[PDB]
Design a protein around this ligand. Structure first.
Ligand SMILES: CCCCCCCC/C=C\CCCCCCCC(=O)OC[C@H](O)CO
Ligand SMILES: CCCCCCCC/C=C\CCCCCCCC(=O)OC[C@H](O)CO
Ligand SMILES: CCCCCCCC/C=C\CCCCCCCC(=O)OC[C@H](O)CO
Ligand SMILES: CCCCCCCC/C=C\CCCCCCCC(=O)OC[C@H](O)CO
Ligand SMILES: CCCCCCCC/C=C\CCCCCCCC(=O)OC[C@H](O)CO
Ligand SMILES: CCCCCCCCCCCCCCC
Ligand SMILES: CCCCCCCCCCCCCCC
Ligand SMILES: CCCCCCCCCCCCCCC
Ligand SMILES: CCCCCCCCCCCCCCC
Ligand SMILES: CCCCCCCCCCCCCCC
Ligand SMILES: CCCCCCCCCCCCCCC
Ligand SMILES: CCCCCCCCCCCCCCC
Ligand SMILES: [Ca+2]
Ligand SMILES: [Ca+2]
Ligand code: NA
Ligand code: NA
Ligand code: NA
Length: 297
């Protein structure tokens, strides 16, 4: 039982580690095949693939009458993706953002501010429908602007991508299930801590994929994955949750998100996303986890 937990834990870590690199390599190849930028592949295929855990979690939680967990997971993930994921990644591989990606980030910022505003009194199912529609438009707009028989180069590419994605998603699940089994076996299971960590657990794919990308200096892919994941978590995970039940307001977390998103845009536009910017993101992340209410909603 503690043995099984340790086996899942370790296997999960292995699958996350190697799976992330395969997903990155396959995604980079696919980008070249389709003549799109790494940012575009990161913001679309990679972002959505890695946000499948958030979407399922938020949908399930709300369906099970825990809308606090549903929104806690969605917004907590966005904060994790900028504070921790981008923070670490930026230190590993500093990013200078080109003029067109800057505009994509501005659109992201507007979307986040829009979500925060309509969310002041919580999120209804109509809020969800709107955010989902905007999410779809964002994807199509992003692909438009970043764009332009059986081929073994392409097949290998898709295999790498899909197997890598399977690897990170199964890996994250095993890692989390393993941790939970260990905690249970050692009699240190704590529901409040567990729910606090939901958003982190679902963000393990984003974390490992972004670190793998950063190690290969694929800065545009890192940024696309972070920006795209946050949009997927709001227009997808949060939105779907709101379809099952009204989601209670999280005004403090949304304000933290808006502040981090604003900083991300300002750095992108006027500076770079490098070592000191990453240090700041991590510092804000650490302050957030030190001070935000526990329980994940
Ligand atoms: C073909 C590529 C997608 C394959 C499966 C989709 C994801 C299936 C599993 C979704 C699990 C959601 C979950 O409960 O969390 C999992 C996450 O990996 C940790 O928390
Ligand atoms: C298309 C590009 C050009 C246009 C860009 C526009 C960007 C707007 C984003 C933030 C400003 C505030 C938007 C505020 C919308 C508030 C709606 C509202 O008050 O809704 C209340 C309802 O209860 C909620 O569920
Ligand atoms: C992805 C590209 C767009 C990124 C974002 C750009 C700004 C969008 C801002 C306003 C238009 C919003 C949709 C049309 C107006 C909806 C107003 C509203 O409040 O919708 C929910 C409703 O309040 C619930 O009761
Ligand atoms: C502190 C080291 C964390 C290490 C990395 C894994 C983080 C994700 C693990 C559980 C989150 C989702 C749990 C949903 C169920 C929680 C059930 C619960 O009570 O778990 C409490 C236990 O304390 C949990 O270790
Ligand atoms: C070969 C293995 C290479 C591994 C490389 C690992 C890099 C890990 C980065 C941070 C660890 C964070 C540990 C604690 C994680 C949960 C933190 C938390 O409090 O999450 C709250 C919320 O759910 C979300 O913000
Ligand atoms: C996993 C689902 C991914 C859906 C991605 C939609 C946009 C694809 C853009 C591909 C490159 C052009
Ligand atoms: C023009 C290329 C992109 C076309 C639109 C792709 C839309 C993909 C939407 C995925 C949505 C996942 C969450 C659904 C609730
Ligand atoms: C640019 C507007 C951002 C709003 C960001 C989220 C927080 C709104 C906080 C409102 C605080 C007072 C609430 C009274 C119910
Ligand atoms: C220069 C812009 C970034 C400044 C970062 C300060 C970080 C302090 C961390 C403690
Ligand atoms: C490749 C050289 C990397 C040097 C990285 C220094 C990283 C410092 C991270 C500090 C995080 C601080 C959070 C508040 C204490
Ligand atoms: C709700 C009240 C939260 C109070 C948190 C007080 C401590 C904040 C510490 C920030 C710095 C943590 C170490 C980096
Ligand atoms: C919901 C509220 C939970 C408690 C919040 C206390 C203040 C947290 C401020 C965090 C600032 C993080 C860096 C911007
Ligand atoms: Ca995720
Ligand atoms: Ca609302
Ligand atoms: Na994602
Ligand atoms: Na998450
Ligand atoms: Na995410």
């Amino acid at each position: 039982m503690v043995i099984l937990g340790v086996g899942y834990f370790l296997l999960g870590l292995i699958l996350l580690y190697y799976g992330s690199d395969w997903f990155v390599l396959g995604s980079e190849r696919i980008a070249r095949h389709f003549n799109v930028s790494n940012f575009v592949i990161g913001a679309t295929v990679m972002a959505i693939g890695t946000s499948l855990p958030e979407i399922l979690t938020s949908a399930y939680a709300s369906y099970m009458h825990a809308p606090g967990i549903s929104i806690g997971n969605a917004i907590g993930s966005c904060i994790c993706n900028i504070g921790l994921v981008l923070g670490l990644s930026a230190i590993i591989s500093p990013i200078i953002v080109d003029k067109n990606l800057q505009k994509n980030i501005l659109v992201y910022l507007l979307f986040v501010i829009f979500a925060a505003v309509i969310g002041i009194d919580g999120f209804s199912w109509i809020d969800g429908v709107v955010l989902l529609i905007l999410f779809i438009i964002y994807l199509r707009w992003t692909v438009k602007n970043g764009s332009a028989k059986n081929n073994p180069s392409v097949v290998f590419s898709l295999v790498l991508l899909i197997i890598g994605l399977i690897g990170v998603l199964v890996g994250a699940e095993l890692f989390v299930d393993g941790a939970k089994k260990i905690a249970l076996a050692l009699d240190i299971s704590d529901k409040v801590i567990g729910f606090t960590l939901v958003a982190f657990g679902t963000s393990l794919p984003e974390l490992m994929v972004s670190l793998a990308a950063a190690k290969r200096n694929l800065g545009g892919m890192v940024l696309g994955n972070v920006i795209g994941s946050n949009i997927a978590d709001i227009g997808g995970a949060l939105a779907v949750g709101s379809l099952f039940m009204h989601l209670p307001a999280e005004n403090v977390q949304m304000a933290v998100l808006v502040i981090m998103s604003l900083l991300l845009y300002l750095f992108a536009k006027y500076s770079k996303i490098g070592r000191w910017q990453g240090i700041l993101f991590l510092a804000l992340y650490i302050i957030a986890i030190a001070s935000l209410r526990m329980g994940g909603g």
